[PDB]
């Protein structure tokens, strides 16, 4: 997230002095790493009612979960930011039905 800015300096240095005047290693440009659109995750419409019809829950939940699988967001489910550690936490609706929730 922002800790990664440390590594890219220091891990160069150990290699840099090894070449010392040779063809040194360039840096890949910064905008590549600014964008979340090269990552599957997007880090951060929805209609809570209580999810009362079950037969429509079946049709809607699968599209939103298919989004959540690749890191795109859904409506009722939404991926919440965890790139500080290699994981991910996903947020569910607290009004989601008891069967569909599990």
């Amino acid at each position: 997230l922002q800790q990664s800015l440390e590594l890219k300096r220091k891990m160069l240095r150990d290699k840099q002095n090894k070449k010392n005047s040779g063809q040194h290693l360039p840096i890949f440009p910064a905008w590549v790493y600014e964008r979340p659109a090269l990552i599957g995750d997007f880090l951060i419409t929805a209609l809570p009612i209580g999810t009362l019809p079950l037969a429509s829950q079946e049709s809607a939940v699968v599209e939103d979960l298919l989004y959540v699988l690749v890191g795109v967001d859904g409506r009722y489910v939404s991926a919440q930011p965890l790139a500080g550690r290699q994981s991910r936490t996903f947020l569910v609706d607290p009004n989601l039905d008891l069967s569909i929730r599990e």
Binding site: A37, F42, Y67, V72, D73
Partner: protein, 59 residues
Amino acid sequence: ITEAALVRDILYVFQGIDGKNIKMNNTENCYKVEGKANLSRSLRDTAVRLSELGWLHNK
């Protein structure tokens, strides 16, 4: 709306030619999407993901 509009729209976004549901084509460097069906993952997330290929092509 329909997704068949989104294919021909993001096509324009690729080339550096003006889009249809979208009006930013590297004039702010941020891409701003106009809601025509209010989709937050199939009009916004996918469109801004695919718009960076057009930004690379412009570059």
